[PDB]
Amino acid sequence: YLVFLFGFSTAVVTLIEDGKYNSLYSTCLELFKFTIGMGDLEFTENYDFKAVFIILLLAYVILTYILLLNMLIALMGET
């Protein structure tokens, strides 16, 4: 999960142009919020190519929230 979070957060922060969320820490926190049921999906607009932003966010959400956490529940059940 940490590998995936760092990769997608670096991609998103690279896409962002300027503003409050042009820092690695801020974007990392914004993306971690998705894990605890508080993700925004529209936390910033300082970019071009809104499609790239939404595609990145959706891919991260599908890979982590919908797959990894439920798989963790299943593996815990096995153990």
Ligand X SMILES: CCCCCCCC[C@@H](Br)[C@@H](Br)CCCCCCCC(=O)O[C@@H](COC(=O)CCCCCCC[C@@H](Br)[C@@H](Br)CCCCCCCC)COP(=O)(O)O[C@@H]1[C@H](O)[C@H](O)[C@@H](OP(=O)(O)O)[C@H](OP(=O)(O)O)[C@H]1O
Ligand Y SMILES: CCCCCCCC/C=C\CCCCCCCC(=O)OC[C@H](COP(=O)(O)OCC[N+](C)(C)C)OC(=O)CCCCCCC/C=C\CCCCCCCC
Task: List binding-site positions for Na(+).
Answer: 37
Q: What angle do CA 1, 23, 27 make, to 5 degrees?
A: 35
**Residues in region 33-72 near ligand X by CB under 6 A:** 55, 59, 63
| Residue located via tokens 């595609």 | 55
**Among the listed residues 20, 27, 29, 44, the single contact to its own copies using CB under 8 A:** 29
- In angstroms, give the least distance from the CB of 38 to its own copies: 7
Site for its own copies contains 72 (CB under 8 A): yes
Distances (CA, A) of 76 to 44, 68, 79: 36, 12, 5
